[PDB]
């Protein structure tokens, strides 16, 4: 019961990546502003599958 | 006059990758500039993910 985003990523790792890249996570998750999320940023390349 | 080499390059830095990330950071990356042969590699998302 430690997964997120309907994928294999744990809440810990997702939280750490989002905090490291967008300063997001201590005040609720949400899609970061586009200008903060460049081509090599985290969220853009995240792709859950099932 | 003085052959005091002003470029001290190590083999630990990855200057190529550094410039790759800088070009993404400061400006848009999608657009193509022919002069520097500036055209970032990319796959078709309907091929990477079916």
């Amino acid at each position: 019961g430690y997964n997120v985003a309907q994928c294999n990523m744990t809440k810990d790792w997702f939280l750490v990546q989002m905090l490291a890249n967008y300063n997001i996570g201590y005040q609720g998750f949400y899609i970061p502003e586009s200008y903060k999320d460049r081509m090599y940023s985290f969220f853009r390349n995240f792709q859950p599958m099932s | 006059a003085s052959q005091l080499n002003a470029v001290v390059d190590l083999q630990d830095r990855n200057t190529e990758l550094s410039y790759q990330l800088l070009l993404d950071s400061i400006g848009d990356r999608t657009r193509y500039f022919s002069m520097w042969n500036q055209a970032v590699d990319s796959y078709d998302p309907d091929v990477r993910i079916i």
């Binding site: 490291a20 890249n21 967008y22 300063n23 903060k36 | 990330l21 800088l22 950071s25 400061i26």
Partner: peptide
Amino acid sequence: NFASLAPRHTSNMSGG
């Protein structure tokens, strides 16, 4: 001092 020239009318890898 140099106003006669003016027209008249840091990034490290992270930092959010």
